[PDB]
Enzyme design. Sequence first.
Site, PDB file in Angstrom:
ATOM      1  N   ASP A   1       0.845  -1.188   0.000  1.00 48.37           N
ATOM      2  CA  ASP A   1       0.000   0.000   0.000  1.00 48.37           C
ATOM      3  C   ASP A   1       0.886   1.245   0.000  1.00 48.37           C
ATOM      4  O   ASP A   1       1.759   1.404   0.864  1.00 48.37           O
ATOM      5  CB  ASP A   1      -0.919  -0.001   1.225  1.00 48.37           C
ATOM      6  CG  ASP A   1      -1.855   1.202   1.266  1.00 48.37           C
ATOM      7  OD1 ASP A   1      -2.559   1.464   0.265  1.00 48.37           O
ATOM      8  OD2 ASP A   1      -1.898   1.877   2.313  1.00 48.37           O
TER       9      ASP A   1
ATOM     10  N   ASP B   1       1.076   5.151   0.440  1.00 44.63           N
ATOM     11  CA  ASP B   1       0.387   6.282   1.039  1.00 44.63           C
ATOM     12  C   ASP B   1       1.226   7.549   0.901  1.00 44.63           C
ATOM     13  O   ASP B   1       1.807   8.046   1.872  1.00 44.63           O
ATOM     14  CB  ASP B   1       0.048   5.978   2.504  1.00 44.63           C
ATOM     15  CG  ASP B   1      -1.056   4.942   2.649  1.00 44.63           C
ATOM     16  OD1 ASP B   1      -1.443   4.315   1.637  1.00 44.63           O
ATOM     17  OD2 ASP B   1      -1.546   4.747   3.787  1.00 44.63           O
TER      18      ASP B   1
ATOM     19  N   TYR C   1     -11.870  11.689   4.770  1.00 49.56           N
ATOM     20  CA  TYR C   1     -11.845  12.213   6.135  1.00 49.56           C
ATOM     21  C   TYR C   1     -10.791  13.323   6.198  1.00 49.56           C
ATOM     22  O   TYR C   1     -10.114  13.590   5.201  1.00 49.56           O
ATOM     23  CB  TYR C   1     -11.575  11.105   7.176  1.00 49.56           C
ATOM     24  CG  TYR C   1     -10.545  10.059   6.773  1.00 49.56           C
ATOM     25  CD1 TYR C   1      -9.183  10.368   6.730  1.00 49.56           C
ATOM     26  CD2 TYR C   1     -10.935   8.756   6.455  1.00 49.56           C
ATOM     27  CE1 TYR C   1      -8.239   9.415   6.363  1.00 49.56           C
ATOM     28  CE2 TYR C   1      -9.998   7.795   6.088  1.00 49.56           C
ATOM     29  CZ  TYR C   1      -8.654   8.130   6.050  1.00 49.56           C
ATOM     30  OH  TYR C   1      -7.723   7.184   5.693  1.00 49.56           O
TER      31      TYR C   1
END
Length: 567
Positions: free
Chosen positions: A290, A292, A370
């Site tokens: 992943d 990020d 968010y």
Amino acid sequence: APTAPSIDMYGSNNLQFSKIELAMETTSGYNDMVKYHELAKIKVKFNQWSGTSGDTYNVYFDGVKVATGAITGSQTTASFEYGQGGLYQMEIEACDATGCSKSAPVEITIADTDGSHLKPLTMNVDPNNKSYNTDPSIVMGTYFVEWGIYGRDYTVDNMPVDNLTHILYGFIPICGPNESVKSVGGNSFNALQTACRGVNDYEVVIHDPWAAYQKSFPQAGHEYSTPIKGNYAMLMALKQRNPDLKIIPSIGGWTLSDPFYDFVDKKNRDTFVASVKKFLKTWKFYDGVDIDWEFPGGGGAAADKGDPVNDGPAYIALMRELRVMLDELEAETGRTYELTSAIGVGYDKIEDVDYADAVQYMDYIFAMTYDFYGGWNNVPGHQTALYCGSFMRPGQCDGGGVDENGEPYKGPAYTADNGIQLLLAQGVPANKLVLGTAMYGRGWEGVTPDTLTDPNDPMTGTATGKLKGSTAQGVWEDGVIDYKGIKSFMLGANNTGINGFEYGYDAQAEAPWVWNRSTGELITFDDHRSVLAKGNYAKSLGLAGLFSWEIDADNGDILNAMHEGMA
């Protein structure tokens, strides 16, 4: 026949062996601390103190011969190598011309980082986490943070693993420029500098080896001699309990993104991709990678960094290059590896990357829906809303309008729906998008009734500063609070409000708040209702599913709502 060998437990390191060598009592460079071997060295002593010892020995694992050699009188050391981790029933056989005699079977442990040698982890999950029958093809993801085992006291065995498809482990640093790490602290920066000694820049390392593999967790049955401990050993044992679970290392995040800006030079991407391949071979429980990167084009922790022209192409090339590498691993191992990314969903973030191009190489995009508003300034707003809230001015939702001071809204407002729609508008397929829920609130103080332009909406007020609190209340950083803290200290059992707070909900935005009118304390978060709205939204659009940040901050309510909304 010769006398049957008697295996010497004490003299054979209690039959505990390992493919991985991990420093336990020091802290130094990653390559100094972590040593992985393709074959474990096995050394088993046996004796035949009475009768005839014979000529040769055979070693069996689960009835299959694994080693052979010569008997050396009444005491023999059997040395061999083994490339597969696990628990095996070992027998040692002694042979001569007359025949063979087998020892009693005894369990041998060979540690490998897939956790093959480990029993299913014993869980200790908050019973508030309920049982569901969610379609297994739906992504139900969360982030588990390495540092959550300290003050937050949240360990691997606390995770409601049955309610998760994906666990993203935050965060894996990249060696190189990392000034943003200092915003966490000098200790954290120094830990990274130590980890990166004898490591090339742009290679991955473990930030906190104590948390990762050194700390003894009694609930996991870790002992002084245990070759792998910490969160990593527990995740390995977790994989044994739930073999379909995907555990993916998360590289970067807010404070660990600085080196990504140097990925405009392919040489640095080459170095990174190669180190990730090595990392995945070293730590076999991991199921992919992943990325990020916060953020291509800039807008992250380092205010000065960002190339709006070259970062997007570098990001797309990185995904292509990682997928090539993962395919290599798939051919070598027969396994399936996933490639994902958590991305900003503000219009200004999305416009810096052609995600239609990038996504062809990727399994999932975790849309970070968010952190839209927060205590970094005095402007209240819904931090994780689905739609445009009542507080928003004419022309703010879609952009083109003007703020209270006359300054133009240059693009669409920060909402979850705006982000998803902008991604789809690029041509990103819905079934690769994962919608984010917040397991925490952001908060202000000083938002008192006299500051409101709409007396019935605290989101129209103005703050004097950040939300303050204690760690007992789930306030680990000013202006941020665990959802479980909000529930216990502001909502109460019936969600009617406690300790001076009232509950409210923007039915348009799909966003809850708690508000203390007297102190002006105002918190924006996700609750049962807003999460259900997100789940219903995900189903309607055919999104891949849902993910959350961060599970330690949930009491079960948020993940419960995630499943209930996806039903």
